[PDB]
Amino acid sequence: GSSGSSGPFCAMENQVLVIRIKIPNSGAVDWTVHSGPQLLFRDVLDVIGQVLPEATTTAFEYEDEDGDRITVRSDEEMKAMLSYYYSTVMEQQVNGQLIEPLQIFPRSGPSSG
């Protein structure tokens, strides 16, 4: 996680984040994320690792506006994925419909050295 919290409070203006890891033939798990903004790529992998311990991940995908399923292989992509969720989430609120969980998929592959 975040080494060096210094103060068990966790500040955040925007509501917490909820990541929905698409589980293989087992529904999906919701990773209660409070540091939606203060989230790193590794963190995700650090979490997923607990979700799919028998199935590596490293990276993950997330449906965008055109539901083209993006790919996050670098913190860069992450900030992006989050940049969309919030850009869309806020839109889901102004509209009315309830907000949806950041539907992500643990890119599990065969290789794993």
Strands (E), 1-113: 17-22, 28-33, 60-62, 70-72, 102-106
What tokens were used for 83? 């940049």
What tokens were used for 36? 């939606």
CA atoms within 13 A on the CB side of 47: 21
Secondary structure class of 30 (helix, strand, coil): strand
Q: Which residues pair with 22 in a beta bridge?
A: 28
Q: Return the DSSP state at 44.
A: H
Closest to 85 measured CA to CA, from 103, 98, 68, 60: 103
- Distance between CA atoms of residues 73 and 91, nearest Å: 26
Secondary structure class of 22 (helix, strand, coil): strand
Q: Are 22 and 100 in contact (CB under 8 A)?
A: no
- Distance between CA atoms of residues 81 and 107, nearest Å: 15
Q: Return the DSSP state at 83.
A: H
Torsion angle of C-alpha atoms 103, 43, 82, 48, degrees rounded to 10: -10
- Distance between CA atoms of residues 56 and 51, nearest Å: 10
What tokens were used for 110? 């065969």
CATH, domain 1-113, list 3.40.50.150, 3.30.460.10, 3.10.20.90, 3.20.20.70: 3.10.20.90
Element (H, E) at 50: helix 41-51
Phi, psi of 74 (to 5 degrees): -155, 145
